[PDB]
Amino acid sequence: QQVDPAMLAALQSQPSGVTPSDDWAAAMDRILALTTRNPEAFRQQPQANRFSAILEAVVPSRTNPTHEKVLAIVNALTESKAIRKDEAGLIYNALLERVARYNSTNVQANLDRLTTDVREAVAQRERFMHDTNLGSQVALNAFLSTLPANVPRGQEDYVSFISALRLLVAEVPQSEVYQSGPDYFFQTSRQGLQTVNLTQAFKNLQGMWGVRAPVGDRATISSLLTPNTRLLLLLIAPFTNSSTISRDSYLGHLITLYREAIGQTQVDEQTFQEITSVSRALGQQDTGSLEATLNFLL
């Protein structure tokens, strides 16, 4: 939920009340009675909690940030799942033994360099959540360095389909591709369904890019296509404008018609939101509020 780990290190090892040992500029801010909200609040403390603050502010203490700088590292390693969460009580029990064994002027200044690049040079972790080359760009640029670029029929639409497929894994942060076994896959979401067999799809689409099929043929592709190729073309449909594969290829009978099939449900869901909200507006059997509703929409 947080952005930075060192703020949680500054939340688990700093005093919540204002002390002059660490925040002098706020502890002296209220001794001299110069504060906007509640100014006159330090005279009326007795000699117990005046001298226990007014001595320690005009000459500060000299504490040791060794126990605090390591929590800005041990947290920064468990935020990125390098360590198990069940385990950080051991490594801080081992790093604090480490940097007190080999302590110097250098290591106290070398940890302090390392609690800055886990703050402002950990912006790469903010970066490839957006560009998602975790598993979407550099894991697919091996796939595009695997397919043959010499297709006999349809030389131009072959390199515009994968030009529209690299855009698919780029405009979606959740989708990713990977190497499992001798073939590459592609899931549209983490914790997600609809895994396409990406090797067994472009091998099915090879020798298929030029057909120029007529518009009176529907039930032939049970022995020609494969339903995951029929689902990969479903996942390429919203990111494919009308200028990719124009009109008369058999993919124009597929990719354009898949956008119309998505174009049905992206307005009939708004119809389905109306019907399920008027069954309780007039009084309708909720068991029979979905049987006849779906049959009108399928």
Partner: protein, 44 residues
């Protein structure tokens, strides 16, 4: 004080209520360090 007469030899028990605080912490695994205070009869 001045007290009554008795039979046995007796002892005059004084219980000064004088601040006993311990401040322990451990920076390691098996390095526990105690800081005491009692402030008359000082010890640290």
């Amino acid at each position: 004080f001045e007290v009554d007469p008795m039979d046995e030899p007796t002892l005059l028990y004084v219980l000064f209520e004088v601040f006993d605080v311990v401040r322990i912490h451990q920076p390691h695994r098996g390095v526990i360090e105690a800081v005491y205070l009692r402030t008359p009869f000082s010890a640290g």
